[PDB]
Design a protein around this nucleic acid. Sequence first.
DNA 1: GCGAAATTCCATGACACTACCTTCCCAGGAAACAGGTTTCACCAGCCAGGCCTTGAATGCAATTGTCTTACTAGGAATATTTGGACTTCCCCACCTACCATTCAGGTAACTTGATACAAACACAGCCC
DNA 2: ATTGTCATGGAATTTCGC
Lengths: 99, 110, 110, 83, 94, 94
Amino acid sequence: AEWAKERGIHLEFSTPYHPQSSGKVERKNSDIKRLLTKLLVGRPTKWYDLLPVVQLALNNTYSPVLKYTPHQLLFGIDSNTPFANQDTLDLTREEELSL
Amino acid sequence: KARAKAKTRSSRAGLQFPVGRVHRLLRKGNYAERVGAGAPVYLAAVLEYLTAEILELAGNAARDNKKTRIIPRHLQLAIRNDEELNKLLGKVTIAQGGVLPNIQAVLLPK
Amino acid sequence: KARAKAKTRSSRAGLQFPVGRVHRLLRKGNYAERVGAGAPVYLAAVLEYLTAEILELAGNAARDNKKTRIIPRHLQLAIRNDEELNKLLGKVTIAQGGVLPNIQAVLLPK
Amino acid sequence: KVLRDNIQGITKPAIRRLARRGGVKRISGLIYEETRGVLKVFLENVIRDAVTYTEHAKRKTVTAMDVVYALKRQGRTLYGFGG
Amino acid sequence: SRKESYSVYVYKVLKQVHPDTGISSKAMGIMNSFVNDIFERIAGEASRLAHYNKRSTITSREIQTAVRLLLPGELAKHAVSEGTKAVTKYTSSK
Amino acid sequence: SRKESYSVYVYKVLKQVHPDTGISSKAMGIMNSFVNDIFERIAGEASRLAHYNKRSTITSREIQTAVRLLLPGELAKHAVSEGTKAVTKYTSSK
DNA sequence: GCGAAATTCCATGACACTACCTTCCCAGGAAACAGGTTTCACCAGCCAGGCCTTGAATGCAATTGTCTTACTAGGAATATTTGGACTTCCCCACCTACCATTCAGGTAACTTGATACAAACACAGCCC
DNA sequence: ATTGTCATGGAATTTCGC
């Protein structure tokens, strides 16, 4: 907590013995253990290699009920990834900030 | 916040020798890597039976020679009076004790 | 890719007893937590001096009784012939050896 | 399984032959009831320490290293069988 | 600094079977050093019982075999049954 | 499965000072079990030297004191100097 | 309007710190072991005769045990003087934890090789 | 002085062709 007051971090803690309170992290831990599960089928679990993959493979999975990348909702446009949108390249970046 | 009442594990087994102190003398003495939760309980009992059995016998020799406190002569003499306590400490010198009173009954005067 | 020539640490010290095998018998015997890199070197030398000193003496008793191979009687007799080797193994029975030839020179015939 | 009268299996010459290895010329006839006593004391302090190892690993066979571990305990080390 | 000891836990046993009895300083150190020695015989035989059966674990079974080895005859009958009371009382609690 | 041993490393010492000499099977096991016993005397006295001086570390100094205790007289003069050759040769390498 | 196709919907499940522990199975093989038969040779049990060793009785000699005195050194108390063990604080090198790579050893096999044992005739050493 | 969630496949829905 004494480091957290330096940054301006407002720490928030769940109610005890209630893992349902922490919402998304209990969901993405069911994503990370369904990405690293799928990569590591039929080999020794050398998962320290595959961690730069996971925060680039999950962060470009389209939310199938929001229809966006995590990259677009965080930044605004795709980075140099396979299968990246060109539908935003018909626009001006100086104005699509408020879009 | 506060927490519950800290009940010591020596009072949860009915002993007097500690189990918290014995359980860090099985993980800082390199005896093994894993030490069960019941092993320093069971060992603090056997340290407690044998600490009574000397002092039970050391209480009697203090009483039979009219003493309030137990000096090491009584510990010298409580050991080697009992047979099975002596076979445990058969190699062991006790400091400041001397020996038992003993004559081989051949040196008796003529 | 390939790598360099694997030079064993027994050949990097001029010994014959291994240091790779001794260094995993100081970390799987719970002797301590950290084992220095020089300690199984130094211990494989002392295992190698004392393995010679019996077999040096076990070679002679094989030769003095006209034998090619060293049977345990020679190991029985190489020990207890040397004085300082005997004081190390003063408590130790060697299997299938018997004892040294000995008469107390009072039982000699009249 | 019970087979008695086998402290009397340590026969009269086989204690004399053990006496000759110690360097003993003349013996009495009353060592034979002393040796069988001192022998069964020594096997009631090894088998009693050996079986508690074999029971501890829940084995039914007191193996070769067990006895050596018992003789390790008393301070009389036996080489040649392991341990 | 701090010297840990078993001196306090003797008065909690001395005042159990002889409540009108003191004990001297130089006799405390014997019953102090009786404990530390009879500690590491039982531990140091339970330790070497871990390697002989290829386990990294000192259970409360292994202390029982390392008391039936060190204690002879009639002490090995009591100090076993004076431990399994203090375990069954312990485990039914908590 | 695998039984580790010191049997191979005897022929690499037997063929150093008596190159025309064999050794039997049941005499190998003595020099096998000579090693494993004289191993754990030196280790098991260097081990108890770690607790007596409050260090978690077996150095190559502690094996030297646990050879000047177990070996008597004239073996304690050679087996010390037959180790410090094999260390100084070792550390000047690598 | 039917069908095909493009799309939105929503009910749901799993993530939450995890390994042991027990008892039975399987299994192959092997471990010998416990069980048992078989036969031959040998070691143990049997008993007595002769001799030597032990026990006892003994007389005596010096060895040893006690008494007494002059005394030397041990111990304790002292001051002090001196010699150090451990607590302290900090940094670096060394050990470890790791994976990949490779080498060596153990098992294993087939062969080879060499020695020890068993047997026979004789020699030498010691004793009656 | 705190609170599920969200990827996912039938299946229902809408587009829409002409």
